Each structure stands twice: as C-alpha cells, then as structure tokens.
Amino acid sequence: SGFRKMAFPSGKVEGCMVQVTCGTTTLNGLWLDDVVYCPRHVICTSEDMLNPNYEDLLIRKSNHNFLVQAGNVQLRVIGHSMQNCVLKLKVDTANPKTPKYKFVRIQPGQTFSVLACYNGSPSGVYQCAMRPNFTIKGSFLNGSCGSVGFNIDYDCVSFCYMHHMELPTGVHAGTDLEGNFYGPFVDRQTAQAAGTDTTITVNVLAWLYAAVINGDRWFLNRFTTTLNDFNLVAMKYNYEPLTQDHVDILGPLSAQTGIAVLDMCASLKELLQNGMNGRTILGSALLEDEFTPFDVVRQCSGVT
Amino acid sequence: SGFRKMAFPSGKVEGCMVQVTCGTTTLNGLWLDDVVYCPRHVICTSEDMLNPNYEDLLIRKSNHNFLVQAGNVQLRVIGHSMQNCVLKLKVDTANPKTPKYKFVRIQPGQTFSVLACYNGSPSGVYQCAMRPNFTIKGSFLNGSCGSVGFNIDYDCVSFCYMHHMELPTGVHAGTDLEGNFYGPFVDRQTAQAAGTDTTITVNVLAWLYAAVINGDRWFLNRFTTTLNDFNLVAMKYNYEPLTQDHVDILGPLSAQTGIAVLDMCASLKELLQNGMNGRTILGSALLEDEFTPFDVVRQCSGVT
Ligand SMILES: Cc1ccncc1NC(=O)[C@H](C)C1CCCCC1
Numbered sequence: 001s002g003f004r005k006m007a008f009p010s011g012k013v014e015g016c017m018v019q020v021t022c023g024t025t026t027l028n029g030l031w032l033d034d035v036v037y038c039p040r041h042v043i044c045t046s047e048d049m050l051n052p053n054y055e056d057l058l059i060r061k062s063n064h065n066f067l068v069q070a071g072n073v074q075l076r077v078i079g080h081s082m083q084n085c086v087l088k089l090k091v092d093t094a095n096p097k098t099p100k101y102k103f104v105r106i107q108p109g110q111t112f113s114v115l116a117c118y119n120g121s122p123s124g125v126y127q128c129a130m131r132p133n134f135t136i137k138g139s140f141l142n143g144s145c146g147s148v149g150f151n152i153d154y155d156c157v158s159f160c161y162m163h164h165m166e167l168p169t170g171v172h173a174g175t176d177l178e179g180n181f182y183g184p185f186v187d188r189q190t191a192q193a194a195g196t197d198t199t200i201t202v203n204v205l206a207w208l209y210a211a212v213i214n215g216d217r218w219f220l221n222r223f224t225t226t227l228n229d230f231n232l233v234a235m236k237y238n239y240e241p242l243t244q245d246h247v248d249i250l251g252p253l254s255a256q257t258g259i260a261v262l263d264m265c266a267s268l269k270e271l272l273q274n275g276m277n278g279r280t281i282l283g284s285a286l287l288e289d290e291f292t293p294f295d296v297v298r299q300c301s302g303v304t
Numbered sequence: 305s306g307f308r309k310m311a312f313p314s315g316k317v318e319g320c321m322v323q324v325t326c327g328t329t330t331l332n333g334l335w336l337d338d339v340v341y342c343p344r345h346v347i348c349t350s351e352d353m354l355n356p357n358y359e360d361l362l363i364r365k366s367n368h369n370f371l372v373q374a375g376n377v378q379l380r381v382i383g384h385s386m387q388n389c390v391l392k393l394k395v396d397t398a399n400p401k402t403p404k405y406k407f408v409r410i411q412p413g414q415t416f417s418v419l420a421c422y423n424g425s426p427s428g429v430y431q432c433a434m435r436p437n438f439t440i441k442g443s444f445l446n447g448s449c450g451s452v453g454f455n456i457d458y459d460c461v462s463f464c465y466m467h468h469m470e471l472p473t474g475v476h477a478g479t480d481l482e483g484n485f486y487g488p489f490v491d492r493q494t495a496q497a498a499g500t501d502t503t504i505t506v507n508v509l510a511w512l513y514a515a516v517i518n519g520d521r522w523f524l525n526r527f528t529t530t531l532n533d534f535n536l537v538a539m540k541y542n543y544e545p546l547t548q549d550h551v552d553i554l555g556p557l558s559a560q561t562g563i564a565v566l567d568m569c570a571s572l573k574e575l576l577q578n579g580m581n582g583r584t585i586l587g588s589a590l591l592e593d594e595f596t597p598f599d600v601v602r603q604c605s606g607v608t
C-alpha cells in the first residue's frame with residue numbers, strides 16, 4: 001500500500017540522450033537507431049528567436065555544423081532534415097542502446113514521464129499529465145530543450161513528447177516525435193495564448209479510487225448522482241465533462257472496490273462543493289488529476 | 305522554471321536489480337560487484353514471520369537454495385552471510401553494470417529516490433523523504449522488498465535504503481545497506497510503534513524559496529521573526545525546531561532571492577497560523593517538506 005506520483009524507470013531513455021550543438025546553441029537530442037531527433041530551434045541565434053525563418057536558417061547549415069556527442073563519443077552526421085518542428089540528423093552509427101520503441105501522439109489528459117536533461121545528461125525524472133489545453137506543467141530550465149516524455153509497456157518505450165518551449169506564463173510546450181506541437185503553439189519567442197485549462201475529471205475519480213484502495217475513505221458519502229447532474233457541477237468548477245467512455249475506463253476500479261462510478265462522482269461533487277475541510281487525500285490537500293485510471297491499476301497491482 | 309518532485313535518473317540502479325528466491329519467497333536483490341544484497345526475510349515462510357529466529361532459519365539454507373536471476377541469467381551463489389537484517393550472497397560473476405557506488409546511512413529529513421521493483425523488475429521511480437521518525441511514506445506492495453533508495457552525485461550512486469516492511473499503519477520501514485533498520489523497527493510481523501513524526505522545517509523553508517524563485521510569492525509578508533519566536537510556533541504545529549545549522553544550509557537560497565531566512569520564517573509562521581486560504585504554492589495546497597535545500601538548488605540550477 002501507499003500511493004505515489006511514480007515515473008517510469010528512465011534507464012532505457014537515458015541510453016538515448018545525446019547533446020546537440022549548432023553554432024552557439026546546445027540542447028538535447030534523442031538517438032534511436034541511426035537518427036538523432038532534436039528541436040529545430042537548435043539552429044537559431046538570439047536575433048532569430050522572435051520569428052525565425054527555419055527553412056532559410058537550415059539552408060545555411062551543413063551536416064558538419066551539427067555536433068552530436070553521446071558523452072564520451074562524437075557521432076558522425078551524414079544527413080539532416082527538418083520534419084515539422086524537429087530536426088532528424090542521420091548518423092553513421094546506430095545507437096547500441098536503442099530500446100524497442102514507438103512514437104505516439106498522446107491525448108490530452110494522458111500522463112507520461114519526463115527525463116529532464118541538460119547538455120545531453122539526465123538530471124531527473126518526473127511524472128506529469130498533458131493538460132486538456134495541451135501544455136504541461138514541468139520543470140525545465142534553458143538547455144532542457146530536447147528532453148523527452150514517454151511511457152513504457154513491458155520492454156517498449158513509447159515516446160510522446162519532446163520539450164521545446166516555456167511560455168511567458170511559465171508553463172511548457174512541446175511536440176510529438178514527428179515535430180508536431182501539442183496545442184496551438186509555434187516555436188518562436190512570442191506571447192502565446194494557452195487555452196482555458198480544465199481539471200481531468202476521469203483522473204481525479206481514478207485517484208479517489210486509489211485513495212479508497214489505500215485506506216483514505218473519509219470522503220465517501222451516502223449519495224449518488226447522474227452523469228447529467230455531475231456534469232452541471234463539473235461545469236461550475238471547470239472540470240472536464242464525464243462521459244460513458246470515462247465511466248467505462250473506470251470499470252476495473254469500480255469492480256475492485258465495489259463503489260459504483262456514479263457513487264464516486266457524488267463523493268467528488270461533495271468535495272467540489274464543500275472542499276476538503278482542512279483534510280487530506282493520499283497526502284494531498286487538493287483534488288489530484290495526474291493519475292489516469294490505467295496508472296492507478298498499474299501502481300495498485302505492481303506492474304513491471 | 306517550474307518545480308517538480310523529481311527523482312534521480314534510475315538507470316544506474318536498474319542495472320543492479322535482480323530477483324532472489326529462497327523456497328517459497330521471492331523478492332528483490334541488489335547486485336553490486338560480486339555480491340547480491342537482499343532482505344534477510346527472504347528465508348522465512350508464513351509460519352516464521354511473527355518472530356523468526358533468523359540465525360536458525362539461515363542454518364537450514366545452503367548457497368544452492370538462493371536462486372538469483374538477473375532477468376535472462378542465473379547467478380551462481382558461492383557464499384552467503386547475514387549482516388544485521390540483510391543477506392549478502394557472494395556470486396561468481398561481478399555485475400558488469402555495477403556503477404560507482406557508496407553505501408551511506410542518511411539522516412532523517414534527507415530525501416532520496418526509490419526504484420520500486422517486483423520480481424527483480426523495475427516498476428517505477430519516485431522521490432521521498434526519510435521522515436523525522438525514520439519511516440518513509442512509499443508505494444510498496446508485497447514483493448517490493450529489496451527495492452532500494454539512493455542519491456546520485458555525478459557518476460556515483462549512494463545507496464541509502466533497502467525496503468523491508470510495511471507497518472500495520474501503512475507506512476514503510478527499511479534498512480541502510482549494512483542491514484541496520486532506520487528507526488526502532490524489527491523485521492517481524494508485529495504491530496510496532498513509529499515515533500511521533502514532525503514536519504521537516506528546513507525543507508518547507510527550502511520549498512518556499514523554490515516557490516519565490518518560480519514566481520509563487522503571495523505568501524511573502526512585511527514581517528520578520530526570531531529563531532526563538534519561530535520555534536514556539538514550530539512547537540505548536542509539530543514542526544522540527546529550526547537551528548542555526550538549518551539557517552546556514554539555507555544561505556545560498558537566501559542569497560539568491562535576497563529574502564533573509566528569518567523573513568522566510570515569518571512567512572512560514574503566518575502560513576502555519578492562518579493556512580493557505582484556499583490558495584496554492586507550486587501546485588500544492590499544503591506545506592511541502594520533501595525537498596531539501598540541496599534539492600532546491602540542484603533543481604533550480606539544472607545539475608546533471
Ligand atoms: C528559457 C526556457 C526554459 C525552459 N524551456 C525552454 C526554454 N526556452 C525557450 O522557451 C526559448 C525562449 C524559445 C524556444 C522556442 C523558440 C523561441 C525561443
């Protein structure tokens with residue numbers, strides 16, 4: 001028992017991190033097979049950053065201008081291409097530490113682990129959610145660009161995020177591994193509106209189930225609700241409307257605990273309307289939304 | 305910017321995890337050089353667990369009774385010995401993935417990362433603090449015994465914890481890597497008093513500094529306090545008394561932000577006396593104590 005904000009073991013991803021330098025800029029790259037992936041803004045300088053013309057900036061670069069170093073060793077670049085907001089540097093050596101991997105585009109509300117890196121070296125790992133507004137609330141300083149987000153299913157790493165930018169509000173934006181930004185963001189130093197965010201309702205319910213499984217049950221009440229009634233409350237409190245698909249995903253947790261999903265919704269309604277009254281749930285004094293129902297099941301069953 | 309509960313990259317520790325089986329019991333072991341370390345209770349059965357006579361139980365075991373498997377490969381055990389609550393199984397092969405490492409006994413209030421494992425396979429990584437009462441609030445199910453806690457300083461892994469037991473209260477207990485329990489705990493299935501715990505004051509102050517560095521400053525006030533006055537408040541609220549040694553450790557954060565440590569203490573006093581008023585600090589609705597001043601500096605500077 002006990003419930004923690006757990007990240008995936010980062011070892012398989014640590015073996016893929018490299019440092020990429022182009023001119024004056026250094027950031028992180030992801031070396032999988034014979035390709036190194038990194039944010040395309042590695043080719044910019046300070047003057048370029050307001051509205052870079054990436055196609056033109058890249059035309060001034062040759063394979064030998066991209067310095068790729070995997071700690072002790074220098075990689076030989078034999079090709080370069082830009083795909084959306086990422087550069088793909090073909091190298092002459094396949095990464096001997098390439099794990100089984102996939103590139104996936106995650107949905108908002110899904111979670112993943114980030115391995116924060118500086119100069120191609122890993123500094124730490126943390127779990128986070130892709131906000132409904134397509135931002136992430138990470139921990140990234142200048143130089144962390146190119147750090148990646150991922151999930152692991154047995155021996156397969158699904159890479160879902162590459163870090164590109166910090167918005168002026170201090171929230172983070174990035175792309176899938178094909179270089180497509182999550183959200184409306186563009187890789188330029190401009191103020192950019194992140195949409196209105198919402199709380200991930202299905203994740204809060206999943207975390208309430210993890211709380212009951214682990215002994216925190218003070219919030220369970222004698223009430224029930226309907227999806228319609230609950231969604232009026234979700235509306236008032238900027239929570240995502242709950243759907244039958246969300247109820248269906250919560251099925252295993254509802255079955256294991258014997259607490260009907262709409263009964264848990266009535267606990268959540270009361271917590272939204274009355275607050276925690278100075279109490280905590282799983283060490284938190286707020287309603288946590290960074291655990292998906294899959295995360296709760298995985299953690300509560302000890303999946304490796 | 306942004307501040308997260310970050311764990312160390314777990315790769316160097318993943319390469320050391322093995323599965324140890326003795327009879328009917330399977331748990332995790334730590335393979336460093338030619339020795340595998342695991343909790344001594346791997347030699348117990350269900351009948352033994354109320355008050356095992358470990359010396360007698362171990363005498364019924366031979367090297368060939370300890371089955372050690374590092375995924376695809378079986379290790380040959382050529383020696384066994386019990387040191388405090390750990391067993392040390394000498395194997396004929398040095399772990400080729402042995403990182404530079406140290407065994408350290410951490411102080412209460414210090415933090416570390418745990419790589420939770422089942423059957424020698426890593427499931428996840430999380431950061432936690434050793435409570436002032438020598439327990440940890442982890443996430444461990446049956447089979448996670450032998451999972452370890454550690455810190456990393458550049459290329460050196462300092463192992464500080466091995467998981468042994470879940471107390472009847474759902475909190476966790478374990479040993480240093482010489483098998484000495486942190487706290488009063490004994491490896492037997494009995495109800496055991498964990499002392500009165502307290503909040504790690506120096507860590508809360510460090511986290512208030514991380515909050516100011518990252519833009520959350522609403523809690524700063526026009527007041528100051530003294531160590532004496534602050535400690536009367538710390539007393540009332542079950543916080544550790546602050547000492548000049550704690551003020552000294554906060555020096556770098558005080559210098560970087562320009563907020564005198566006693567001025568931050570006066571912010572903390574007001575938060576203790578008035579609560580958060582429904583507001584948050586770094587995404588938390590409570591005063592966080594799982595970040596040491598060293599953690600804050602490391603995270604806010606991007607150390608690898
Ligand atoms: C500073 C920082 C901190 C954390 N994460 C990222 C960054 N870097 C930036 O967001 C650049 C300013 C941006 C990058 C995209 C192109 C325009 C320039």
Ligand SMILES: Cc1ccncc1NC(=O)[C@H](C)C1CCCCC1
Nearest residue numbers: 345444445446468469470491492493
């Ligand atoms: C169940 C569980 C969950 C999480 N962590 C550990 C455990 N296992 C135990 O604490 C045993 C009961 C204990 C181990 C010490 C010797 C007496 C028996």
